[PDB]
Design a protein around this motif. Structure first.
Motif, PDB file in Angstrom:
ATOM      1  N   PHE A  47       1.846 -16.988  -9.233  1.00 52.10           N
ATOM      2  CA  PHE A  47       0.548 -16.606  -8.647  1.00 52.10           C
ATOM      3  C   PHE A  47       0.434 -17.089  -7.187  1.00 52.10           C
ATOM      4  O   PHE A  47      -0.073 -16.406  -6.328  1.00 52.10           O
ATOM      5  CB  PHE A  47      -0.595 -17.190  -9.470  1.00 52.10           C
ATOM      6  CG  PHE A  47      -0.833 -16.506 -10.791  1.00 52.10           C
ATOM      7  CD1 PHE A  47      -1.699 -15.433 -10.892  1.00 52.10           C
ATOM      8  CD2 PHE A  47      -0.190 -16.938 -11.937  1.00 52.10           C
ATOM      9  CE1 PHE A  47      -1.920 -14.814 -12.113  1.00 52.10           C
ATOM     10  CE2 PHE A  47      -0.386 -16.294 -13.146  1.00 52.10           C
ATOM     11  CZ  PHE A  47      -1.254 -15.239 -13.235  1.00 52.10           C
ATOM     12  N   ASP A  48       0.866 -18.322  -6.935  1.00 48.79           N
ATOM     13  CA  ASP A  48       0.702 -18.935  -5.636  1.00 48.79           C
ATOM     14  C   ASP A  48       1.825 -18.450  -4.713  1.00 48.79           C
ATOM     15  O   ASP A  48       2.754 -19.189  -4.397  1.00 48.79           O
ATOM     16  CB  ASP A  48       0.662 -20.453  -5.767  1.00 48.79           C
ATOM     17  CG  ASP A  48       0.461 -21.159  -4.441  1.00 48.79           C
ATOM     18  OD1 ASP A  48       0.135 -20.476  -3.465  1.00 48.79           O
ATOM     19  OD2 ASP A  48       0.604 -22.414  -4.403  1.00 48.79           O
ATOM     20  N   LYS A  49       1.704 -17.203  -4.269  1.00 54.67           N
ATOM     21  CA  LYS A  49       2.744 -16.487  -3.574  1.00 54.67           C
ATOM     22  C   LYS A  49       3.164 -17.192  -2.276  1.00 54.67           C
ATOM     23  O   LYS A  49       4.333 -17.068  -1.885  1.00 54.67           O
ATOM     24  CB  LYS A  49       2.295 -15.065  -3.214  1.00 54.67           C
ATOM     25  CG  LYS A  49       2.021 -14.145  -4.397  1.00 54.67           C
ATOM     26  CD  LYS A  49       3.263 -13.825  -5.186  1.00 54.67           C
ATOM     27  CE  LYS A  49       3.011 -12.835  -6.300  1.00 54.67           C
ATOM     28  NZ  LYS A  49       3.990 -13.015  -7.392  1.00 54.67           N
ATOM     29  N   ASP A  50       2.237 -17.880  -1.603  1.00 50.94           N
ATOM     30  CA  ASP A  50       2.528 -18.527  -0.331  1.00 50.94           C
ATOM     31  C   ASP A  50       2.707 -20.040  -0.514  1.00 50.94           C
ATOM     32  O   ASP A  50       2.926 -20.736   0.437  1.00 50.94           O
ATOM     33  CB  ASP A  50       1.447 -18.196   0.702  1.00 50.94           C
ATOM     34  CG  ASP A  50       0.129 -18.917   0.491  1.00 50.94           C
ATOM     35  OD1 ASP A  50      -0.093 -19.487  -0.594  1.00 50.94           O
ATOM     36  OD2 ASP A  50      -0.659 -18.920   1.428  1.00 50.94           O
ATOM     37  N   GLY A  51       2.620 -20.536  -1.750  1.00 53.86           N
ATOM     38  CA  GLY A  51       3.028 -21.889  -2.061  1.00 53.86           C
ATOM     39  C   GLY A  51       2.160 -22.943  -1.405  1.00 53.86           C
ATOM     40  O   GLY A  51       2.608 -24.055  -1.218  1.00 53.86           O
ATOM     41  N   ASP A  52       0.889 -22.613  -1.147  1.00 51.76           N
ATOM     42  CA  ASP A  52      -0.064 -23.536  -0.570  1.00 51.76           C
ATOM     43  C   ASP A  52      -0.790 -24.375  -1.634  1.00 51.76           C
ATOM     44  O   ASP A  52      -1.646 -25.208  -1.301  1.00 51.76           O
ATOM     45  CB  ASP A  52      -1.090 -22.773   0.265  1.00 51.76           C
ATOM     46  CG  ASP A  52      -2.205 -22.212  -0.599  1.00 51.76           C
ATOM     47  OD1 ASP A  52      -1.887 -21.561  -1.660  1.00 51.76           O
ATOM     48  OD2 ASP A  52      -3.374 -22.431  -0.219  1.00 51.76           O
ATOM     49  N   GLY A  53      -0.465 -24.170  -2.913  1.00 47.81           N
ATOM     50  CA  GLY A  53      -1.030 -24.951  -4.021  1.00 47.81           C
ATOM     51  C   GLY A  53      -2.377 -24.415  -4.486  1.00 47.81           C
ATOM     52  O   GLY A  53      -3.056 -25.053  -5.264  1.00 47.81           O
ATOM     53  N   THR A  54      -2.729 -23.203  -4.048  1.00 45.26           N
ATOM     54  CA  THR A  54      -3.930 -22.523  -4.498  1.00 45.26           C
ATOM     55  C   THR A  54      -3.616 -21.043  -4.741  1.00 45.26           C
ATOM     56  O   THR A  54      -2.723 -20.471  -4.119  1.00 45.26           O
ATOM     57  CB  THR A  54      -5.097 -22.705  -3.503  1.00 45.26           C
ATOM     58  OG1 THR A  54      -4.952 -21.826  -2.383  1.00 45.26           O
ATOM     59  CG2 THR A  54      -5.205 -24.134  -3.006  1.00 45.26           C
ATOM     60  N   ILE A  55      -4.393 -20.445  -5.656  1.00 47.81           N
ATOM     61  CA  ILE A  55      -4.359 -19.032  -5.954  1.00 47.81           C
ATOM     62  C   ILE A  55      -5.667 -18.440  -5.451  1.00 47.81           C
ATOM     63  O   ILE A  55      -6.739 -18.871  -5.851  1.00 47.81           O
ATOM     64  CB  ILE A  55      -4.183 -18.745  -7.454  1.00 47.81           C
ATOM     65  CG1 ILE A  55      -2.926 -19.409  -8.004  1.00 47.81           C
ATOM     66  CG2 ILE A  55      -4.197 -17.239  -7.709  1.00 47.81           C
ATOM     67  CD1 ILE A  55      -2.921 -19.482  -9.512  1.00 47.81           C
ATOM     68  N   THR A  56      -5.542 -17.440  -4.590  1.00 48.21           N
ATOM     69  CA  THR A  56      -6.680 -16.752  -4.012  1.00 48.21           C
ATOM     70  C   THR A  56      -6.854 -15.432  -4.753  1.00 48.21           C
ATOM     71  O   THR A  56      -5.955 -14.979  -5.521  1.00 48.21           O
ATOM     72  CB  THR A  56      -6.478 -16.466  -2.510  1.00 48.21           C
ATOM     73  OG1 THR A  56      -5.291 -15.668  -2.357  1.00 48.21           O
ATOM     74  CG2 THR A  56      -6.380 -17.719  -1.660  1.00 48.21           C
TER      75      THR A  56
ATOM     76  N   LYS B 156      -6.692 -12.657  -3.406  1.00 47.91           N
ATOM     77  CA  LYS B 156      -5.724 -11.658  -2.902  1.00 47.91           C
ATOM     78  C   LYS B 156      -4.350 -11.864  -3.557  1.00 47.91           C
ATOM     79  O   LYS B 156      -3.634 -10.888  -3.829  1.00 47.91           O
ATOM     80  CB  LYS B 156      -5.669 -11.669  -1.373  1.00 47.91           C
ATOM     81  CG  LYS B 156      -6.805 -10.892  -0.723  1.00 47.91           C
ATOM     82  CD  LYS B 156      -6.879 -11.003   0.787  1.00 47.91           C
ATOM     83  CE  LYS B 156      -8.226 -10.565   1.313  1.00 47.91           C
ATOM     84  NZ  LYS B 156      -9.303 -11.422   0.763  1.00 47.91           N
ATOM     85  N   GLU B 157      -3.984 -13.120  -3.818  1.00 44.57           N
ATOM     86  CA  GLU B 157      -2.757 -13.417  -4.541  1.00 44.57           C
ATOM     87  C   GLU B 157      -2.846 -12.933  -5.995  1.00 44.57           C
ATOM     88  O   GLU B 157      -1.865 -12.407  -6.531  1.00 44.57           O
ATOM     89  CB  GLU B 157      -2.465 -14.912  -4.497  1.00 44.57           C
ATOM     90  CG  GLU B 157      -1.806 -15.345  -3.198  1.00 44.57           C
ATOM     91  CD  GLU B 157      -1.779 -16.848  -2.997  1.00 44.57           C
ATOM     92  OE1 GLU B 157      -2.573 -17.544  -3.644  1.00 44.57           O
ATOM     93  OE2 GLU B 157      -0.944 -17.338  -2.227  1.00 44.57           O
ATOM     94  N   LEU B 158      -4.014 -13.130  -6.630  1.00 50.77           N
ATOM     95  CA  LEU B 158      -4.212 -12.653  -7.972  1.00 50.77           C
ATOM     96  C   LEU B 158      -4.050 -11.136  -7.954  1.00 50.77           C
ATOM     97  O   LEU B 158      -3.386 -10.584  -8.810  1.00 50.77           O
ATOM     98  CB  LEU B 158      -5.591 -13.059  -8.488  1.00 50.77           C
ATOM     99  CG  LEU B 158      -5.934 -12.560  -9.894  1.00 50.77           C
ATOM    100  CD1 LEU B 158      -4.865 -12.962 -10.896  1.00 50.77           C
ATOM    101  CD2 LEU B 158      -7.294 -13.072 -10.329  1.00 50.77           C
TER     102      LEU B 158
HETATM  103 CA   LIG Z   1      -1.640 -19.515  -2.330  1.00 50.12          CA
END
Ligand SMILES: [Ca+2]
Ligand SMILES: [Ca+2]
Ligand SMILES: [Ca+2]
Ligand SMILES: [Ca+2]
Lengths: 139, 15
Positions: free
Chosen positions: A14-23, A25-27
Motif C-alpha cells: 500500500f505504501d507505494k512511496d515508502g513514507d510509512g503512511t498510506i494515503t 491516492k496510494e489506496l
Molecule cells: Ca505513502
C-alpha cells in the motif's frame, strides 16, 4: 506472532512511496491494480474507517490494528461457514429439519426440530440458509 | 441448544 512480518509486507504494498503512511491516492492505486475503480469519496471513506488518530493517513500501527480485526472476523466467518457446511449434508445451501435432526442427536422429534427451524427461518421457506444461520449463531 | 451446537463445534472442529 511472526505474522507482523507478513502484515508489514502487505502494508509496504500500500505504501507505494515508502513514507510509512498510506494515503487515499496510494489506496486508489492498489484498488485499480485489483481491477476496482473507486471514487475519491469511496477512497476517503476507506481511509477514514482505519484512520484511528484522524490525521488523514494510515500508519503501520493503524493498519496492523485493522488487519488483526479483519483476520479475527475472517477466522470467525470461516468457522461459521464450516459449521454450516457440516449441517448442510446435501450441500443444497439450506439446512432442512431432517439435517438439523440428524446432526442434533449426534434425540429430537420432527416437531421439536421444526420449531428450531422456524425460530431461525427469517424468510419463511421452512429451511435455514447461511444468512439465517449466521444470524442465529451470532445473536 | 445453540449453546450445545457452539460447544460441540468447538470440540469436533477441523476433522
Ligand atoms: Ca505513502
Ligand atoms: Ca492516521
Ligand atoms: Ca441441506
Ligand atoms: Ca429460510
Amino acid at each position: 506472532e511472526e505474522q507482523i512480518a507478513e502484515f508489514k509486507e502487505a502494508f509496504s504494498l500500500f505504501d507505494k512511496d515508502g513514507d510509512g503512511t498510506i494515503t487515499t491516492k496510494e489506496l486508489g492505486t492498489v484498488m485499480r491494480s485489483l481491477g476496482q475503480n473507486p471514487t475519491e469519496a469511496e477512497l476517503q471513506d476507506m481511509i477514514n474507517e482505519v484512520d484511528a488518530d484522524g490525521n488523514g493517513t494510515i500508519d503501520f500501527p493503524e493498519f496492523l490494528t485493522m488487519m488483526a480485526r479483519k483476520m479475527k472476523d475472517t477466522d470467525s466467518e470461516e468457522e461459521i461457514r464450516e459449521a454450516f457446511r457440516v449441517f448442510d449434508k446435501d450441500g443444497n445451501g439450506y439446512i432442512s429439519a431432517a439435517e438439523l435432526r440428524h446432526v442434533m442427536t449426534n434425540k429430537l422429534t420432527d416437531e421439536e426440530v421444526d420449531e428450531m427451524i422456524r425460530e431461525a427461518d427469517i424468510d419463511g421457506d421452512g429451511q435455514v440458509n447461511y444468512e439465517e444461520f449466521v444470524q442465529m449463531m451470532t445473536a | 441448544e445453540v449453546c450445545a451446537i457452539k460447544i460441540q463445534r468447538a470440540y469436533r472442529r477441523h476433522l
